[PDB]
C-alpha cells in the first residue's frame, strides 16, 4: 500500500487552478485543506488530464463530491457546535470546488450552489459576526443580500461604518471567493456588502448575468444611504474578475458614489470568444444561458467605451500573462484614465495574479483605507 | 514568459511534506499560502529532488529564507497593524519551512527560530487573546511558557477554564503547528498551555531534547494548580510526533495529573536508525546535539517499558504507513493498555496522518471535551 497521494500528472495539469483553490487563508469564509485536495484527487482517473474536457469536470465534480459528503458526515455527528460549522465550512468549500468549473447538469451545479448557501446559513447561526441578510428588489428581481459588519461590533459604541461592496466573478460563489476578500476589509472595522446579482452566487444557472450589474449596485448604494449604521460617503465597490469588469462599469455609471473602486484583474473587453483556453468558453455559455454561437455578439456588447470618464479614484491588480482580460487592453484603459487609475502589474502572473493574492490584498486593504482617510474619514 | 509555477518533478517530491507545510487553516497561528510555495519553489535549481541530501535542504533554506525577508518588507512598509500582523505571521510560516529540515549551519538555523519567535511576540501584542508568557524555572533551566486563554475571556465572568499542555514534535515550531492544533481547544473555551522544553522550539540546537519531558510537564501542571484561572482537576496533555511519545511517558509517570492524553502519531519505540529515510537521521542528531554513532543507543534508552501501566485515558492517532513509529509496535501498546487506550488507525497515511488532521483534530478536540464532561465538567 502507498500512502494516498495526487499524482504528478494531475498536479503539473491544475497548477493554474491550485492558487485558486486554496484562495485565501480565511476565518469565516469556507476552505480546503491540503489533505482535502488529496481525498479529492487521490483515486482520480488516469488518463484524464485535458482541462479543456467535459470528461475531465465530470470527474472533477463526483470526486470533489465525495469529499464534500464526507465533511457533511462529519457535521451531522459532530458533538459540538464549533466542530459542526469547522465541517459545514470544509463541506461548502469542497462543494464550490466540485461544480465551479462544471456546467454539463444546470440542476446538479445549482443543487451544489444551494448546499453551499445552506451551509453558510447555518454557519452565520454560529457565528460572532453581524450578519443583515435580506433581499433587495430591483423592479421584479429579489436580489440575495448580506450586511456583514466587523467582530466585536455595536452600532452604540461606534459611528456610521465606511463600507465595501464586493461582487462575484464569472464563477466565484459568494461566501467563499468573495467573503475571503471581504474579511481584508472586516479586519480595519469597515462594513462589507456582498450580493447575488442576476446570474451570480445561487443565482448562477437561475437567471442570464447582467451586463449593466451597475443597475443592481445602485440599488445597494440607495439601501446603504438609508442605513444609520454605514457612512454612504464612505463606500468602496470592488470587483474579482469578471467582477472587475463591473467595477470598470461602475467607475464610469456611478462613481461619484465611491471614494475608490478595486477592479481585481477585470479588463474593458474579453480576449476572442472563440480562442478562450481551458472551459472559459461553457463558463461564459452558462453564465449569460446563451450557446457558443451567441457568445462573440455578446462580448462585442460588453467591450467598454473607454473615453467615457472614470469618476473616482481606481486600483487594478492585473497579471502581464492574463490569457482572458489581455494586460495591453488594461494598459490602455490605465493610460486613458490618468491619475484617477493606478495599475500594480505583475510580470510573470496569470489572470488574477493568485500566486500573490495575499500580499496585494494587504496593498488593496490599505490602499482603500487610505482613499477614506483622503475622504476624512 | 511562463507563469510562475512549481515544476512537477519537484511537486511530486515533495508530496509526503506538503500537508505538513500547509498544516491546518489557522486564525492566529502563522500559514503559508499556495503562492509563497510558488514564490519558495518555482526557481529551485532543477535536477536536485534528494529528500535524504543536504544539498537540497540548503537550496530549500535559501529560497524559503527568500519568501520570508520579502514578507518581512512588507511588515516594515504596512500602513495598519492588521496588515503588519498579516505580514508577520507570513514570514514568520516562510522562515520555519526554511529551517524545519535544516541542519548544517547551527547559527543560521537558531537564527531563523528566533525570527520565527519575535515575529510571534510582535503578532501577540496586537492579538484579541489573553497570552501569559514567562519562564518556568526547573533547576538551573528556564523554560519559555505560554498561557493563552479563549477568545474574550474575562476571569470576572468565567469559572476556572480546563487546561490542554501541548508538546512540540523533534522539528516544530511552538506558535506554528502546536498553537495550530491549540486553536482547537481554544475554539471550545479551554485554556491552552504551549512551552519550549530542553531542545523544543527555540531551544532545538541550543540544549539538547530530554527524553524525560514529564519532568518540566510537572513543573507546568505546579503552575496550574496555582493559577485560580485554571481548573487543575481538568487537564489534557497533547503531543505531536516525537511529542507524542512523550504523551505516552506523561502516562505512564504523572498520567493521574490528567483526565486525558493525546497521542498525534507517537510511538513507544522508533525505527532502527541507521535506516531511518529522508533527513531524519540529521533531525534526530540536531534535536540531541549528537553525531549519528550515539543515536541508536539514545533510541534504545527512548524505548519504552509498555508494561508500565497508563495511569489516564489516551486517544493515538496513527497511520499505518508511518515509518518513523512503526503502527506494529503502536497495535501491541493498544492491546496491552486495553479499555484505557483507543486506537484511531488510518490504513493508507504515513507519519502523522496528515492528510486526515482537519477531520481527526475534530474528532480529538471533542473526545477531549467529552472526558472532561466525564470528570464532570
Ligand atoms: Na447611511
Ligand atoms: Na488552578
Given at each position: 500500500?502507498?500512502?494516498?497521494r495526487?499524482?504528478?500528472?494531475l ?44 470528461e475531465?469536470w ?5 470526486n ?6 464526507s ?19 470544509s463541506?461548502?468549500?469542497?462543494y464550490?470546488?466540485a ?10 451545479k ?20 453581524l ?11 429579489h436580489m440575495?443580500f ?16 465606511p ?24 479586519g480595519?472595522?469597515?462594513?462589507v ?5 442576476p446570474?451570480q ?30 457612512n ?22 456611478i462613481g ?5 473602486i ?5 479588463g ?5 470568444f472563440?480562442?478562450?483556453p481551458?472551459?472559459?468558453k ?23 467605451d473607454?473615453s ?14 492574463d ?10 484603459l490605465?493610460?486613458?484614465?490618468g ?9 510573470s502572473?496569470?489572470?488574477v495574479?493568485?500566486?500573490?493574492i ?5 496593498q ?10 483622503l475622504?476624512?474619514?
Amino acid at each position: 500500500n502507498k500512502p494516498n497521494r495526487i499524482s504528478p500528472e494531475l498536479l503539473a495539469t491544475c497548477g493554474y487552478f491550485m492558487p485558486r483553490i486554496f484562495f485565501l487563508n480565511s476565518q469565516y469564509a469556507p476552505q480546503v485543506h491540503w489533505g482535502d485536495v488529496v481525498a479529492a484527487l487521490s483515486h482520480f482517473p488516469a488518463g484524464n488530464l485535458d482541462l479543456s474536457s467535459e470528461e475531465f469536470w465530470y470527474e472533477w465534480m463526483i470526486n470533489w463530491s465525495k469529499v464534500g459528503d464526507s465533511y457533511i458526515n462529519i457535521a451531522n455527528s459532530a458533538k459540538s457546535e464549533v466542530s459542526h460549522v469547522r465541517a459545514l465550512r470544509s463541506a461548502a468549500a469542497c462543494y464550490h470546488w466540485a461544480e465551479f468549473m462544471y456546467f454539463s447538469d444546470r440542476s446538479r451545479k445549482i443543487q451544489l450552489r444551494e448546499y453551499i448557501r445552506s451551509c453558510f446559513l447555518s454557519s452565520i447561526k454560529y457565528s460572532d459576526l453581524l450578519v443583515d441578510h435580506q433581499y433587495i428588489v430591483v423592479d421584479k428581481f429579489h436580489m440575495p443580500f448580506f450586511l456583514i459588519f466587523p467582530k466585536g461590533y455595536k452600532e452604540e459604541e461606534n459611528h456610521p461604518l465606511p463600507c465595501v461592496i464586493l461582487s462575484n466573478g464569472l464563477d466565484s460563489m459568494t461566501e467563499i471567493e468573495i467573503l475571503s476578500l471581504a474579511e481584508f476589509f472586516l479586519g480595519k472595522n469597515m462594513a462589507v456588502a456582498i450580493f447575488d446579482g442576476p446570474g451570480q452566487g445561487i443565482n448562477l444557472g437561475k437567471s442570464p448575468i447582467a451586463i449593466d450589474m451597475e443597475l443592481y449596485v445602485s440599488s445597494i448604494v440607495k439601501l446603504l444611504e438609508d442605513d444609520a449604521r454605514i457612512n454612504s460617503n464612505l463606500l468602496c465597490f470592488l470587483g474579482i474578475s469578471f467582477g472587475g469588469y463591473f467595477a470598470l462599469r461602475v467607475a464610469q455609471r456611478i462613481g461619484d458614489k465611491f471614494c475608490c473602486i478595486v477592479n481585481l484583474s477585470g479588463g474593458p473587453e474579453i480576449a476572442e470568444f472563440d480562442k478562450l483556453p481551458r472551459r472559459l468558453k461553457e463558463d461564459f455559455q452558462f453564465a449569460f444561458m446563451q450557446d457558443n454561437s451567441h457568445m462573440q455578439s455578446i462580448f462585442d456588447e460588453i467591450k467598454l467605451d473607454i473615453s467615457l470618464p472614470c469618476k473616482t479614484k481606481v486600483f487594478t491588480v492585473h497579471g502581464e500573462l492574463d490569457d482572458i482580460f489581455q494586460i495591453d487592453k488594461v494598459k490602455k484603459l490605465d493610460q486613458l484614465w490618468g491619475d484617477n487609475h493606478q495599475l500594480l502589474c505583475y510580470e510573470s502572473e496569470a489572470h488574477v495574479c493568485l500566486n500573490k493574492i495575499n500580499e496585494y490584498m494587504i496593498q488593496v486593504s490599505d490602499w482603500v483605507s487610505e482613499q477614506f482617510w483622503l475622504n476624512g474619514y
